[PDB]
Structures are given as structure tokens and as C-alpha cells.
Amino acid sequence: RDLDALPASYADWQRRLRATTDEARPAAVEKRHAAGKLTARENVAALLDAGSFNEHGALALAAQRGRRSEEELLALSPADGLITGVGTVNAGQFPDTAACAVAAYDYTVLAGTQGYFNHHKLDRLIALAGQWKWPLVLFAEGGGGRPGDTDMPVAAALVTPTFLNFAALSGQVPLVGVAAGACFAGNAALLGCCDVVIATRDSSIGLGGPAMIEGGGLGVVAAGDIGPAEVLAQKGVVDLLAENDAEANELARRYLTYFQGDVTGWEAADQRELRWVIPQVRKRAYDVRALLHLLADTGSVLELRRAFAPGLLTALVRIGGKAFGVIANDPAVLGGAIDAAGADKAARFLNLCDTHRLPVLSLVDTPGFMVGPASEAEGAVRHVSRLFVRAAKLTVPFFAVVTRRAYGLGAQAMAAGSLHAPALTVSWPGGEFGPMGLEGAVRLGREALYQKLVAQAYAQGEAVNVAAHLEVDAVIDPAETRNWLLRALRVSPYSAQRREGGLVDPW
Amino acid sequence: GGRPGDTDMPVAAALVTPTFLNFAALSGQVPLVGVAAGACFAGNAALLGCCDVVIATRDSSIGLGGPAMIEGGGLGVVAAGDIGPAEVLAQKGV
Amino acid sequence: ALPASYADWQRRLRATTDEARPAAVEKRHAAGKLTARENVAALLDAGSFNEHGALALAAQRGRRSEEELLALSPADGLITGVGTVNAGQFPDTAACAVAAYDYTVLAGTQGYFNHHKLDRLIALAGQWKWPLVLFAEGGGGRPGDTDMPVAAALVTPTFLNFAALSGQVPLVGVAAGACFAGNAALLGCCDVVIATRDSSIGLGGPAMIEGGGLGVVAAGDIGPAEVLAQKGVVDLLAENDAEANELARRYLTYFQGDVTGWEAADQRELRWVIPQVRKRAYDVRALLHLLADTGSVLELRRAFAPGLLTALVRIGGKAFGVIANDPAVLGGAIDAAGADKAARFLNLCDTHRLPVLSLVDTPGFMVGPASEAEGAVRHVSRLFVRAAKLTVPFFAVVTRRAYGLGAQAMAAGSLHAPALTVSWPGGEFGPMGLEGAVRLGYEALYQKLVAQAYAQGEAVNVAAHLEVDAVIDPAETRNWLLRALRVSPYSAQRREGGLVDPW
């Protein structure tokens, strides 16, 4: 009985446990690091706080005992290629809301494929995550269903509940998906059900891998690669585009902070600069992202889904340490008009914020909904209707700041249905309101009478007159925006409970 | 869509109208049936798009902007007919 | 500096300030009154105010220049917004909405735009649970808002939506002058009505009175606050605008949570406030100020039904609502008006989640044909019906007399209805009244039977029969209550669809 030693019977367990470590698999780690990539174990170590990890199923092996020796399986399939457990994330800043489940496929184990045992491993984590409300971070790198788990009898294997039970977590807990490499079939199915999709630039994502496609050799010269992260970002599948595994890992940690509570020690730029971001000349464009970074807490801006529907910006930010979701028109894209894709992007982001109980700020500078036969052929009538239907069901505080233009139903949709739907609606002094392009409206409805009617219509749509008719709550100094928003939020009580049976629509 | 000549009432921009939000709020509470039998533009189309089902006659044209609204900003000349033909919008899921 | 385009906005914004209207401020101060802007500044903490609709003007753009409207109708005569009140002491429960009519702007009348201003404030207050303070001074509906054509204009939901806030949030009404028609309608729906002595409140103004055939009344005489205090319409009678404003802040503190740094008198004084000699009266308000934390007593509705006292107080920093019989009025008997006052006060405390203390010193319900002709049977039943639905802690302290059904009503239905019922050593209990009881049932034998009945009603024998939980030293009253409240958990949530009945 030596307390500085272990009983000799622990040897076999310690041996099998070492076989799962990166240290015991140098060849695999080297090939991984040679590509500038992280191992599955390294992703768990970078995500979770040290010493917090309760691992489930570490000693698991591939369901191929009938074909392989015990020693061959141990070298072939440590953890059966999936690391599952629960720890804490960002516990230094959020000690009371740091719970975090993790599921990380190991691509060096059978191409990160989904086998019999690692399916059950993920099933158990899903069940616990739903019962105990664990946020779940999924590193989905892998090639889909595994061929050759011969130990267990099956016919078609279409009973697997993993994808349904994982999808059921939507609306219950934050779901973070990280794709760092190949991510096909069932691996991609899980990814698509997450609140946010982070993908490295070198990633390829699809419902079917190269083998399932059978486009052949050279199929790629004409068709292109299956799902390059850069394309999928433009098509709205990838929300955050990372340059490397480490950055994709950090983006998972960053993303979660917005759902872990308030922050202290925040900073803010000189708010007087907001008076000069938008030119006093009409039409002359400006950088909306510059305006947002001035308005938001220093360093708190995490824009989501930028490449998709770029006419409408969506970002998680902080104002006074308080987590906000922001929607904003980019006047540099389509004049800031709201098209079918912009409505989807805005609607789903409202879904995200309302489900996870974050307030929403809307920066309005839009000429309204896009129009014309090309727009209608994109289904614009239905897609913009997402906004009114979603905004009518919000149960979080909603604040609207008209920075410049606010025209038509599109402007009303940006303000959650109307300029009085928000808990607070303010205009900057340069605000111009009305329906549709004011110059074109009046003349279709020689120089002296036209300029008379134009000037009266602009004067009727001026911020001061719109406010005098109570359509906005106030005209404010742009430098006072944060104060107005924080004072309003301070007196905007709402429930922190998530609605039972709610969900975050993947689109 | 919106009527331009209602001069009796004082207005600035008239963007406080809750009709479109309150109509969309009925979704999930009751069945909402949308019937478009002709031209259906702007706010008229907004209400239609929020319904559970959209019924349209083949001669209907549906869009978020009428001809005047389309020329009002860049996209030049289009007749009402060609803005959003029901047969096209049927293919595009509207 | 500011971009040159801000010039127009800044110009119209200055026009709303008292600085830009010296005459209006001066007319106001000459009368010892505050302007609407000053009421907001005095109520709310500096820098906390989000104002909605400051740039609004009267709906008379067809009759007047914009420059004339700017001088005639800044803010359209109504200041609306949300800030904080008493945030120094209550940082986490300081939200406060305010709507203050400006009498120097079109006689504080209710016009088209300021109606919508108040509509938006009511909707936001109800959704975000803002307490709302209304300075209701004004002459009612405005004649001359010609920009909007109307028929009868009887769809205006302002009064229904404001009344709907009752039971959702605290509603404080301040009347500092003339308050007629719709202005008085809003006021009457508040939890508490504060009025200066120079106020006159009614459902109809002088024109409305003479226009309905009832002759030539001056505004002053329609409904003087001093008279209306006796009639139960005015709950707090202020000497001037400034005191009325202060009374609004004080009233709200009781609904903002517990307090620290409190003080209390020498509780042994409570042994000597009530005479050992029967019949001998005492000052109940002196007793109350000894019991409650020093300076925490705010009596409500004193002029009305003075036989039954109602007051918000603090004990050990904890907010209490207190009801108590005044033995100096009607012998402390409970009449119809005292029942209304008590019932409505229980409504207030239960709705806004305050514990209730009852100081019992009553001969019971008033009797006689005159009392029955005041509807006594119905009015006193409100006590049992109200008390049967309480969901707050209720404590009863019998300081002296406790006779009959009235005493049971003072104890929320019976001496066992409260979570704690204690008697001071001089507690005397019984029915109807002991001297009449013996005489009606049957000189030296009479004095024998009376003394036996009083001995049967002695505190010790009543406690021995378990009708009260204990007989206590009066100096230990605060301790017994605070120990009891500490183990009296209850929901701080307000009831959905609840209300505070204006009567």
C-alpha cells in the first residue's frame, strides 16, 4: 500500500487509455500538424477550460472485433474516432454559465466516419445535453457513414436516431458547428442543424462525398468542388469563414460568449464620430461596418454570414457589456435595398436572437424592398413576408435607429413591422422618410414645379417632421445613441427562459 | 397598394401603419387564405404573402412594387402583367 | 461641434424648454407652482429620461404657421417618457414612466397628438411594466384640433388602456390645478390621487356644467381637492406642487423593495401609549409612529372615513401596509365608509405584493338604522370577500378592544385568518359589547356579571382559549412581526388580469 503509486491491476486500463492520446500516435499528429491543422484532442483542449472535461466513451473501439485483433483496433480506432464529453467554456469570464458539451470527430481515425459505437457515443451526449441543457460544440470533420462495422447485424440502418435527436437540440441549447476539412453526408447533416456553421477555407461540405457523387475523375473541372467553404459562405450555408483550424476553434469560443451573460469592463469609441460617418450629401455612401464598430463596444463585433445576402448585415455585438443582435442595411450593396435573400438572412437571425433571448438592434438605412420582375422571380413576395410573420412573434426587446433612409414596407420590416413596433425608435437628424424613391415618385405622380414638389416631399419626410407626427419616438444626437439604447434596455424586462418546443430554423 | 390621394389626414411618412404586422400576427392563430385575382402590388401583396395559402388566377400579377414603383427607381418600363405572372410565381413557390 | 444640418432640429428642440418660455415659468412660479418640465426634473433622476414625442405640435397646422405652433404648443402640451425614480436607493427597481400635462400650453387640454403620445406610453408601460406617474392638470378634450376630421371621436382608447394598467404597475396621479373631463378620468383610475389644495377636479368643466343646464360654476368650486379628500377621491392632500411631486416619489419607494439604515424609537414607549384606564382615549397615530421605522409613515386617505386609518410604513426596513381603527372617531367602530377604505387598501397591498399589518382596537361594526341606510350590510361584506382572497402575509395585533364581527373583519376574517395574531396585555375581547350584553340578558349583581364578562374577555383567557397566538409585551411587537414575516414566503409576481378597484 503505497499512496504515491497505483495498484498493479490499473495497468491494462492505463495502457488502453494512453492509446487514445495524441502522444501515443505521433505519426497521425505529424501528418495533421504538417497541414497546419489541429487534432481532435487539440480542439477539445483549445475549446474547454483545463481540468473541466468529463469524457464519455474514451475507451471505445471500432465495431470490427470479428475482423481485427484487439491490438489492431486499438491502433486503428481510438475512441472510435469521436471524442465526447462535457466541460466548461470561457469559465474565467462566465463561471456560472460555462457548461459546454463537445463532440469532435478525429479524421485520423477512419476518415472521421460515423460508426456503430461513435453513433451511440453521440446519442448519449445528445440525450444528456438536452436534459441538462448543455451547449454543444460539434467538430464535424468526417466522411459520413462508415463502411465495415461488421460486428452488428443490420439490413438498411435507417433507424439511427442521431440526426433527429441532434436536430431536436435546436431551440433548447446553443449549437455550434465547426467544419475543418472534409464534412460529408451524416457529418454534414449534423452540421446543418447548428445555430452557427464555422468552416475553414480549406473545407469541403456536402450531403454526399466524392464517392457518393460519382462524377468521376475530372468531374471537378466542369462541376467544381463539392462544397468549397468560400462558395458555401456566399450561398448562406457557412456563417463564419476561418483561415485555419485554430481560428475556427477560437470563433466557437467567441460565438458562445454572447449567450453566457453580461460583461463588465467594456470600452467604447468616441461617440461624436458617429455624427460624421454618414455624409450630409444625399446618396454619398459610407462604410456601415465602420458605423457599427464605432457604436458597439470596442472589440465586441462578430459579424455573421457576411458573404450571403450582403445587402443586409447581421452581427452579434455588445453595447454597454450587453449582448445584442444587430441587423443593418448596407447602402453600398443594391443601395441598401431588401431582397429575398436579405429577408431570409434577417428572419433567421431574428429567430436566433429571439430563441436564445438576446435583444435586437436595427440600423435602418434602406430605400425599401427590392422591386421588379427579376426580384419577384426570386420569390420576393414570400421571402420578405418572413419578416412580418417573425417580427410579430418576437418576445425580446427590439430597438430601431434610423440612421438615414427609411422608405416603404421594407423600412417598416426593418423596424419589426412598423416604426412603433420597437420598444424605442429614434432617428438621427439626417433621417429621410417616405414611400419609395422620392424623386421618381413625385414626377410620375418645367424645372420649377418639379423642384417645388420634390422639396416639399423631402420636407414632409424630414426627421423633425416625422418625429413631430410621432412616427419615431425622438430625433437624437447620433453620439447619444448608446445612452438611449442602454437606458431603454435597462427598463426592458423580459424572460430569460427559452420557449419549450421552440426551434432555430436552419433557413 | 398604398393610395396617394387621402388628403384629409395629416401624415409625414405614414410608416406607423400596424396593419401588415397585425395581419402577419394572425399566422399560427387561425387559417389565413390569400386570393389574388388580378393586380396585387405593394401592401396588397405584403398581406397576401403572409397567408397560409396563396390562390392566384392565371391572369394575376403579384409583386412588392407596381409599375410606377419600378420606374421610380432605376428598373425602367414594365407593364403590370409582366411584374409577377401567376404562372411564374407558381413555379417559384409564391 | 455639430453638423450644420442639425440647426433645424436644435431650434425646434429649444422651443420645448422652459428656458425658451420665460413668461410661462414666471406665471407658474408666481403661483407657487411647478412647470411640467420641472415636475419631470424633480421626479426623475438626472440623465435618466428617454423622452418620446418632444417635437410634437398641436394638430392645427392648417390654421397656424409652424412658428406660431412652435410658440403655442411645444410638445403639444404633454411631456411623456421613461426615466428612473429613487435609483440612488433602488438601482434595480427604479424604472418610472411619466406623463405631465403643461397647463401653460392650451390649458393642458387633451389634443389629437398628445392623446397618441400618451397612448404609446401606456402601451410601452404595460408591456415593459413601468410604474407611471401622471400629472393630470388640464381642462379635458381640446376644442380646435382641426387638422383631423372626426365625427364623435369616441373610439379614443386612451382612457381604457390607461385603466388597463391598474393591477399591472403602480399608478400615481398628481393633480396640481384644474383637472376636468378626460384629464380627471385618467386621474381617477390611479392607485393613489395626490392633489394640491388649489386643485379642482371633476368629470365636467364650467362650460360642460353650464352647457348641461346646471348653471354657472367657477372652476375653483367644481371639485375642490380639500372637499374631495373628505369624499374619498383625493388620497394625499398637498400644500403645493413641490410637495405633491415629493409625495409621488415617497409613495413609489414602498413598491421598490427593502431599505437599510432605518431607525426606531424606544419600543418600551408602546407600553404606555394605551391607558390602563378603560374608556380613556389615546392618539393611535402616535402609536403608529412609535411602532414604524422613524420617518417611514405615509398615511393615505386620512380625510375620508377617518374611523379607519390606512398607511404605508416600514418596519425594520420592510414595507408594510397598515390598517388601524381610530378610537377617537365613532369609538373606533367600523362603518360602511371605513369598510370601503379598508377593503380598497387591502386590494392595493395584495395587488402590489405588500404584507399587511392590522392594529385592532374596535368595538365592532356600526349599528342602527342610519348605518344600515348607508348600505352597511354590503359595504362591510367587502372585507370578508376581499380578505378571503389575500395571497400576502397578514398580521394582526390587538392593541386593546376586539369585539364582534367587525373585529373578525379587521383580522382578515377571524382571529385565526392572519399568519400571526397577537394581543397586547390590555386586550379585551367579546361580542356586541359587555355592558349592554349583561343588561340585555338579565345593581351589585349587575356589577358582578359585567366583571365576570370582562374577565372572560381578558387577553390571557382569550389566549388560553387559543383565539390569539400569544399575548406579547408591546415593546416586542416589531420583533414578533419581523420574525413572522421572515418565514412568510410568498410570490412577488403580480396576478394576471388583476386590478386595483378605484373604490
Added chain:
Amino acid sequence: VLGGAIDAAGADKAARFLNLCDTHRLPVLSLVDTPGFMVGPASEAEGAVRHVSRLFVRAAKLTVPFFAVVTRRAYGLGAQAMAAGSLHAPALTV
């Protein structure tokens, strides 16, 4: 009686009756023929401001159907109170 005016007692009678019907789940019909609330110093001394406020406070919390039929006169705040707060408060106002 009193020209059909609504005084403090009439508000108490009506309010408590609404309480009864709403509590025991009966629909309410209102037959409106009133010049409005009683006015004058004698009325105000009956506590009219508080007593008539009961109608607005009561009607705002109704959860039964309320219908208003204006048979003739409908004047002032009193008529609005007879219609459960405003002419649009009832489920049907004719």
C-alpha cells in the same frame, strides 16, 4: 331618470354587474342612450371621479363577449364607459 345620465351610483351598479357577469361567464349587452357622466359640484361631492373610474378599470379586464347597441344618444366619456371603455372595446358596436 336624470335624463339617462351616469352618476356615481350608476357606475357602482353597472361595474358590480359587470363583475358578476364576467365572473360567472355571461356575455354582456349594453343599450346606450346617455348624455354622458353626470356633472356639477354636487355630483363631484358624491365621489363621481372615483366611482365612474370603476367602469374603465372593470371593463378593461373583461374576458366575456361584450356587445354595444347605441339605441339613441351616446355622448362623452360616459358613452365610452357604457361601451366597455371605447366604441371599439365591444366585439360588436352597432
Added chain:
Amino acid sequence: GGRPGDTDMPVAAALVTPTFLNFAALSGQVPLVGVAAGACFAGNAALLGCCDVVIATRDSSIGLGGPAMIEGGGLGVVAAGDIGPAEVLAQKGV
């Protein structure tokens, strides 16, 4: 009870089977009727014991362990019919 020889798997200890927990979870949700008509041992009796009512024929034998399980650890050679006769178990409240 538990079947030996289902070699298609294999298993380690096979102590994860949720059948007995999930069957017992039906208690209080729906009526549960258990009928024993013969030998009823180990997991078979575990399900039976969780029912609202247990109906057993006289010729039944019910127990948590069959003859093999009994002889498997100490308690010698009992016959199947002797393990838990319905008549005995009726007297003992099973």
C-alpha cells in the same frame, strides 16, 4: 428471462437494456395488466412485477431467478414449479 446464445451481437455485460426502466415508466400513465401463465423468471418477472395488477394461473411459477440462476450461486437445485408458486405468491401479495 434473458436469452443465451444471441451470438449476432456481441455484448460486454448487456446491462444497458432500458426495457425494464421504460416499461416501469408506463406506471401511472396507462393501465398495466400482467398475465403469468407458466414459468416467469428474471426479466420476465421484472416486467410482471411493475404492472398495476398481476394475474397468475395456479400452475405458474414466478421469481427473480430461474433454476439455473439459483443453482448458479449456492442455493442448490430447486425445481421450476417450486420457485414461486402462484398460490404462495397470492398469499404473499405478489
